[PDB]
Amino acid sequence: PRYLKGWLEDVVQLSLRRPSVRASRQRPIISLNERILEFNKRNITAIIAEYKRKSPSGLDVERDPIEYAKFMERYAVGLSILTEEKYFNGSYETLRKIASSVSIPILMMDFIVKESQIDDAYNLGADTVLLAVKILTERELESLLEYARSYGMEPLIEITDENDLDIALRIGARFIGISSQDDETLEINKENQRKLISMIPSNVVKVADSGISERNEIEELRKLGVNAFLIGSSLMRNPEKIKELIL
Ligand SMILES: [Co+2]
Numbered sequence: 001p002r003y004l005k006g007w008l009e010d011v012v013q014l015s016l017r018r019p020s021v022r023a024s025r026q027r028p029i030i031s032l033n034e035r036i037l038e039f040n041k042r043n044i045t046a047i048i049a050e051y052k053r054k055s056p057s058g059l060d061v062e063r064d065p066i067e068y069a070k071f072m073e074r075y076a077v078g079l080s081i082l083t084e085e086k087y088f089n090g091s092y093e094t095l096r097k098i099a100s101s102v103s104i105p106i107l108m109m110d111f112i113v114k115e116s117q118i119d120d121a122y123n124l125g126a127d128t129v130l131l132a133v134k135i136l137t138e139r140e141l142e143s144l145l146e147y148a149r150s151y152g153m154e155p156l157i158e159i160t161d162e163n164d165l166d167i168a169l170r171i172g173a174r175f176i177g178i179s180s181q182d183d184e185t186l187e188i189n190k191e192n193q194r195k196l197i198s199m200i201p202s203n204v205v206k207v208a209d210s211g212i213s214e215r216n217e218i219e220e221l222r223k224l225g226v227n228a229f230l231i232g233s234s235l236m237r238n239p240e241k242i243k244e245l246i247l
Helices: 006-016 032-041 065-072 090-097 115-124 136-148 162-170 192-199 215-223 231-238 241-246
Strands: 047-051 078-082 106-109 130-131 156-159 175-178 206-210 229-232
Touching: 006 206, 032 175, 032 206, 047 065, 047 231, 047 241, 078 090, 090 106, 090 115, 106 115, 115 130, 115 136, 115 175, 130 136, 156 162, 162 192, 175 192, 192 206, 215 241, 229 241, 231 241
Parallel strands: 047 078, 047 229, 078 106, 106 130, 130 156, 156 175, 175 206, 206 229
Antiparallel strands: none
């Protein structure tokens, strides 16, 4: 990993010692990026609904993961499921139980710094993983990228700014998350978002990873080439909001 400060450095070091799982995968990859493209052609708003109990910058939420997942299954293009333990109060078991309960694509949301974490995601039933440009050296980023690919996963590669983007494009990310959040400082910046979206080639599947709040905004971004939308905290508080966003 790169040089990091504060909680991010702590979560990286901790992630390096994450115990691997020996579960076996009992179902093919249902590709997230391909379903998003499917939804785009049928003109269905593609939302990746996120299950997140806790985070350093947000509010704690206790709720039944299975009820949440089964509800979202009706509406979302996929699910994002936090497996980071210390800061996000996630679990491998939650992902495992969720993935066996639904048949839409699942994305494991964690801090992936070693190969066996990608083994965990596959073995647990996840269909893809997120990789952070910020936490990995460019070399680590590309090795884990291809490691993901060897399982048949196209990873969501997260960028926050143009420095991250130059890297993601150089190495040929086909599936990119434009996040308004810098993980290290925890600062949120939505104004760079559209400028960044404008710089991505039309062949990459683009995810807007921010608190999208209304249909008008979704329609605008959609005209700008955003393919899908990752929504977490607002759905964690009021799940049925997803219905109004899609109509
Ligand atoms: Co991030």
